[PDB]
Amino acid sequence: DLDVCAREPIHIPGLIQPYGVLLVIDPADGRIVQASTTAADLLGVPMAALLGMPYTQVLTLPEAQPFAVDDQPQHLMHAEVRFPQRATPPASAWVAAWHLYPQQWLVEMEPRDARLLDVTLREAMPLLRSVERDPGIAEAAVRVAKGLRSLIGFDRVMIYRFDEEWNGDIIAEARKPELEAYLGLHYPASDIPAQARALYLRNRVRQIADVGYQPSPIQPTVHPQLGTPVDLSDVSLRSVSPVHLEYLANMGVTATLVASIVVNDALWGLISCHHYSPHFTNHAMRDVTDAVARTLAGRIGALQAVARARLESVLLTVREKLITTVELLDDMAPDLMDVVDADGVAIFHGNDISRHGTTPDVAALRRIRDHIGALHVDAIGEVFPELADLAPLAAGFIFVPLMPQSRSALLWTRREQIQQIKWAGNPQLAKLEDIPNSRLSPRKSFDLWQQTVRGRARRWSPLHLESARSLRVLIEL
Numbered sequence: 001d002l003d004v005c006a007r008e009p010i011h012i013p014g015l016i017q018p019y020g021v022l023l024v025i026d027p028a029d030g031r032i033v034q035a036s037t038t039a040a041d042l043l044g045v046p047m048a049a050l051l052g053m054p055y056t057q058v059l060t061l062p063e064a065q066p067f068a069v070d071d072q073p074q075h076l077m078h079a080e081v082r083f084p085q086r087a088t089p090p091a092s093a094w095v096a097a098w099h100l101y102p103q104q105w106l107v108e109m110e111p112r113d114a115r116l117l118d119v120t121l122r123e124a125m126p127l128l129r130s131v132e133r134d135p136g137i138a139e140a141a142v143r144v145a146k147g148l149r150s151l152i153g154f155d156r157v158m159i160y161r162f163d164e165e166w167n168g169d170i171i172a173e174a175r176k177p178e179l180e181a182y183l184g185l186h187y188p189a190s191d192i193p194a195q196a197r198a199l200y201l202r203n204r205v206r207q208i209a210d211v212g213y214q215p216s217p218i219q220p221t222v223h224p225q226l227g228t229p230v231d232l233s234d235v236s237l238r239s240v241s242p243v244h245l246e247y248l249a250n251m252g253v254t255a256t257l258v259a260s261i262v263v264n265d266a267l268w269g270l271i272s273c274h275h276y277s278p279h280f281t282n283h284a285m286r287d288v289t290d291a292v293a294r295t296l297a298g299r300i301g302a303l304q305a306v307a308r309a310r311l312e313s314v315l316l317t318v319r320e321k322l323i324t325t326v327e328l329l330d331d332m333a334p335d336l337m338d339v340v341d342a343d344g345v346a347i348f349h350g351n352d353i354s355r356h357g358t359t360p361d362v363a364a365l366r367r368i369r370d371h372i373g374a375l376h377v378d379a380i381g382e383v384f385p386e387l388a389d390l391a392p393l394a395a396g397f398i399f400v401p402l403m404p405q406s407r408s409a410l411l412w413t414r415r416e417q418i419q420q421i422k423w424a425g426n427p428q429l430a431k432l433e434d435i436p437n438s439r440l441s442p443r444k445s446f447d448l449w450q451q452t453v454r455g456r457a458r459r460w461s462p463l464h465l466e467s468a469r470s471l472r473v474l475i476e477l
């Protein structure tokens with residue numbers, strides 16, 4: 001636990017959420033080799049009798065039928081399923097999705113609905129058509145948060161943006177006014193382990209119908225003929241870590257819905273819904289949620305392309321203007337904070353400094369210059385702690401000396417991460433409090449992040465690094 005949990009095999013818990021049923025089927029004979037404890041009361045045949053039974057004898061599949069797959073798996077959408085054995089039919093109608101692998105067929109089934117009416121795309125359409133014509137990622141993120149809360153009735157809807165090192169920042173939130181506010185909160189990467197993110201990208205939408213469900217074990221835990229656990233990696237019924245259930249129980253959240261914000265086949269952030277009352281999200285709502293997640297991800301990517309095209313163009317102007325210095329570079333200094341975005345820029349001439357953005361004094365910058373293709377840092381004190389007192393304003397730099405002839409040089413800076421916290425947007429954030437007797441909480445998470453990012457810049461160092469360094473190579477003129 002705690003450090004061991006960071007590498008938990010969450011894809012193979014041999015447990016599922018009891019709102020559903022899972023059967024593991026042998027593609028050859030078609031026999032149910034393994035099944036959830038839940039399979040007995042639904043299919044109406046005892047668990048022992050059910051194991052080794054050809055799936056044909058226990059469930060009628062009107063719409064889609066399973067088939068032998070050769071290489072890559074095929075995942076069939078949730079379709080009508082009926083149970084030929086059971087005397088009295090179930091309360092609600094059931095639906096079934098197949099996960100076809102070469103060695104196994106995994107059938108997962110859950111109720112079509114909670115005796116409830118589905119949201120339609122037709123209903124989601126004004127949201128989708130609007131979240132695509134919104135200027136800026138922020139503005140669209142908040143439209144999604146509100147729209148989704150109203151569309152799929154939820155107590156809280158939160159939009160997260162992951163950073164370079166996988167730390168999360170709640171950028172949008174829409175909630176009950178009687179509820180609190182987590183807008184502006186930043187949590188560390190460790191809060192969502194590498195596999196937890198993986199499985200969020202893989203399944204497009206993850207649900208926890210009731211925190212504090214009594215797990216349904218898969219019996220036998222491992223395949224009788226293959227001896228392996230069940231890879232619930234594609235199974236939405238997959239049980240949740242006792243560590244996330246601990247976490248959510250502390251907040252009183254009793255049901256979640258997490259959709260992926262996938263941009264350029266990468267997990268950009270997450271659309272996360274939180275209910276304080278149990279809430280099963282049927283397949284139809286899940287799909288509509290994914291339709292929303294995709295439209296928001298589609299728009300943030302479109303804006304990201306627009307920004308990237310601008311960054312290449314500002315660089316295109318800088319290189320064509322260097323064909324015609326120091327002040328020649330100083331005039332294009334706000335633009336120099338775009339090609340390689342940064343809080344501030346501080347050109348050096350020899351002792352004369354010129355700060356243009358959010359940069360520390362003039363005395364401070366000189367101290368940095370005298371300490372030092374082109375050197376860069378993420379923590380101004382890890383390389384030398386004599387400059388650790390000026391980690392705010394400049395915690396991360398890119399010192400690119402032009403030549404040893406002229407004492408001319410460039411220094412890009414980025415403020416301490418804790419400075420760029422949107423406290424204005426949600427004043428609750430500072431006066432926020434911990435959960436009484438808990439080892440995991442949102443308030444406790446903010447502080448853990450603060451620790452792992454104290455004295456650390458806003459990460460940076462991507463394509464900006466060599467694009468910045470190119471200018472040193474460009475000095476040969």
Ligand SMILES: */C=C\C1=C(C)C(=O)N/C1=C\C1=NC(=C\c2[nH]c(/C=C3/NC(=O)C(C=C)=C3C)c(C)c2CCC(=O)O)/C(CCC(=O)O)=C1C
Nearest residue numbers: 005006182187190191192196240241243244256272442445
């Ligand atoms: C050992 C690792 C974990 C620690 C430590 C921990 O706190 N949770 C760990 C494992 C998992 N977290 C998962 C999902 C998840 N956790 C969070 C954490 C938060 N930090 C915050 O500040 C807040 C609120 C203010 C929260 C809720 C978040 C945001 C997520 C994403 C899901 C969600 O938004 O509700 C998971 C996956 C859960 C599963 O479905 O199995 C694991 C394993």
